[PDB]
Amino acid sequence: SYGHLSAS
Amino acid sequence: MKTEEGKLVIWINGDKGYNGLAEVGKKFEKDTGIKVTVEHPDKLEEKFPQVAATGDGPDIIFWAHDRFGGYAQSGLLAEITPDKAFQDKLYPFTWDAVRYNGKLIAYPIAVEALSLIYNKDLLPNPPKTWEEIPALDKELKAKGKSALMFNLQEPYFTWPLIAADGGYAFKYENGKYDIKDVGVDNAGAKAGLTFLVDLIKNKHMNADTDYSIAEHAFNHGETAMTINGPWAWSNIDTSKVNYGVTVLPTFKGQPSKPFVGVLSAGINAASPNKELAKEFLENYLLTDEGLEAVNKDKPLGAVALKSYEEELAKDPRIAATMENAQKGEIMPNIPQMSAFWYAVRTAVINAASGRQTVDAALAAAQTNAAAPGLHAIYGECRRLYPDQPNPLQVTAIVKYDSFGPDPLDYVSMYRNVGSPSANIPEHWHYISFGLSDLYGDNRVHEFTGTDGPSGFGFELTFRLKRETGESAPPTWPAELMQGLARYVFQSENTFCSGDHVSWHSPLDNSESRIQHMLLTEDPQMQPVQTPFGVVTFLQIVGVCTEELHSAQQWNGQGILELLRTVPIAGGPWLITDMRRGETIFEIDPHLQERVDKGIETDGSNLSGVSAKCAWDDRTRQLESVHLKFNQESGALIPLCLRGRLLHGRHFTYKSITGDMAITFVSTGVEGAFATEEHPYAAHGPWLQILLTEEFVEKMLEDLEDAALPKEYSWPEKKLKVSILPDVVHHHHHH
Ligand SMILES: OC[C@H]1O[C@H](O[C@H]2[C@H](O)[C@@H](O)[C@@H](O)O[C@@H]2CO)[C@H](O)[C@@H](O)[C@@H]1O
Ligand SMILES: [Zn+2]
């Protein structure tokens, strides 16, 4: 239900 | 009231005199009518705590005393209550040995210590020093023999050497053990292990040597010496080898220090037979005839019972046993001993194998022994992989608490056979250590006590399809996990099942189409309770950009299920195949229709996303608002508006770098503090803005992304897409 973007 | 006859189930290690014990039980049955069943299961010291929880453990368990404090602390042992006369029959030190927190938790049976055993014919004069042995081996090698062989798989046998120059388990001072002061990585321990590894390097010993090999070697006269305990002698007698039992060799002009063990018998706390057990132990076993019956089978060493001790003390082998026991130390019985033993075992095996240097091995063992969260997780791992006691591990050279780059201290890599029946392929299983609270001393994480999440409350796992010919697990997923961990620590956002992670590069730096990740609950790993909190296990699942987009636009859970229904794409355990060339949509065209049907009717599942964003012009209303996003977040704006606002749902962009957040809200939904009358409202860096269906539709019409910077404006508000001006920092969980 959640998004984490461009973790790098 | 009980109208039944009791019984006795007894556990004793397979190297001990269990037939003699069965004879003592046979006598018990003769006199009492109560059957006594003696069993010698493998790993009984590990099984007992496992089975007692099921209530299916033995009435009585025999083991060296060092294990019993852990069992006791865990509530697995009944307190033993002998009268003074019986306590008087046994030596005080042994009662001391079986004493925990002011209580007696077992009956002491016998004193054990390692001695040097040697073939008098091959070697009439045994060496007084360890340093002699390499020279002696060459000579014996000239005539096809070896100097020394003993069990290198159990640290018990190597410990006398390690302890010799100043290695120790825990420092004993003012009547107690200091559980953070471990003496395994000091110069003396390094020296002892270095000597052992030098013996192996120069081909005087083999790293793979275990108990049975050493036994066979000595008993066939293939080796001149061995190191073992009293129990071993019966078999030597049978070999008809002319042998002597003597003092262990010195190291650096010092006596070898074997850990003294007291074979002890504890009574299960859950046993309905504690009296029958007491009767058996006190009045049948701990007598001249009982201990004689057991000793005849396999020698016990120096028995705790005085009468039989004076009787066996004549034995020069027992005298030698006691000389070595004397020069060594009795094992602590504190609960932390099993973690300590796991730690030392791995270090000795890895150093002897050359998998690791002595320094790296003992440094990890020192830290490892002092580490409960780690030991709990390792416990789960051991439950999953009984077959793999010593996994390949990626270790951070400089640990994160000293601000090394890698926040995961260790990554363990297992080989998982899968289920061929279930059509689940073989694969490598990666498990991380660091996101949870391993050590609990606040070096990285805030310690709050039991209950609640340990650290971030979870660890990462990964399942990578095993390629043909692959002998070992590749190490890159560890670095991948490190990246993810860096994100988690820096952003402060805990991961949950159903989440996705945009990575935008093939995970293994190949040409692979798997460039993204979804997160799900690990299919095998069960959550764990540690003194520092609870740990769950989040498995990483590699996906294509199309699948990521579908997870965003529709939902993660659905896409995961689809991935489960397609085996080459995941299967029931959601294994990642980097060589997979087709999306699930290319495999089954219609399936895409299912998502498309879902999106139009149900919308998006995404409550929010963490991205590079900001907003600008203590609860505050604003006349004007100016929103700022990066391209990627900008590409989600259409998802936010069409995917949720039009379905009466809210959407939140949270910045990872600052403390800001932006929540899009539509009409209704009660909870919002943003009203249509006052569209823009802020609780500090939290901004809530209310948009109407009409304006949402209009906004959707305006936005068609274009080159950056791109600007949108209306009389009340502006919206910028930017080239990552958004810049500049949290460390640890402090
Ligand atoms: O190797 C670690 C091991 O050491 C001791 O086990 C001894 C045991 O005391 C002896 O009775 C005999 O069975 O040899 C064992 C070593 O294989 C500790 O008692 C045990 O807890 C520990 O795992
Ligand atoms: Zn810190």
Author numbering:
A (entry chain E): 333 to 340
B (entry chain A): 1 to 617, 627 to 714, 718 to 740, 748 to 753
From the paper:
SUFU is an essential intracellular negative regulator of mammalian Hedgehog signalling and acts by binding and modulating the activity of GLI transcription factors. Here, the crystal and small-angle X-ray scattering structures of full-length human SUFU and its complex with the key SYGHL motif conserved in all GLIs are reported. It is demonstrated that GLI binding is associated with major conformational changes in SUFU, including an intrinsically disordered loop that is also crucial for pathway activation.
In order to determine how SUFU interacts with GLI transcription factors, we attempted to co-crystallize MBP-SUFU-FL and MBP-SUFU-Δ with GLI1p as well as corresponding peptides from human GLI2 (GLI2p; residues 267–283) and GLI3 (GLI3p; residues 328–344). Therefore, the residues WLG61–63 of SUFU were mutated to DSF in MBP-SUFU-Δ to disrupt crystal contacts between a loop within the SUFU N-terminal domain and residues in the C-terminal domain previously implicated in GLI binding. Furthermore, another flexible loop in SUFU was shortened and residues 216 and 220 in the MBP moiety were mutated to histidine in order to promote metal ion-mediated crystallization of the fusion protein. Peptide modelled into this density forms a β-strand clamped between the two domains, creating one continuous 13-strand β-sheet spanning both domains. Upon GLI binding, SUFU undergoes a large conformational change in which the N- and C-terminal domains come together to clamp highly conserved GLI residues in the middle of a large β-sheet. In contrast, the structures of our SUFU–GLI peptide complexes show that both the N- and C-terminal halves of SUFU interact simultaneously with a major evolutionarily conserved SUFU-binding motif, including the amino acids SYGH, within the N-­terminal half of GLI.
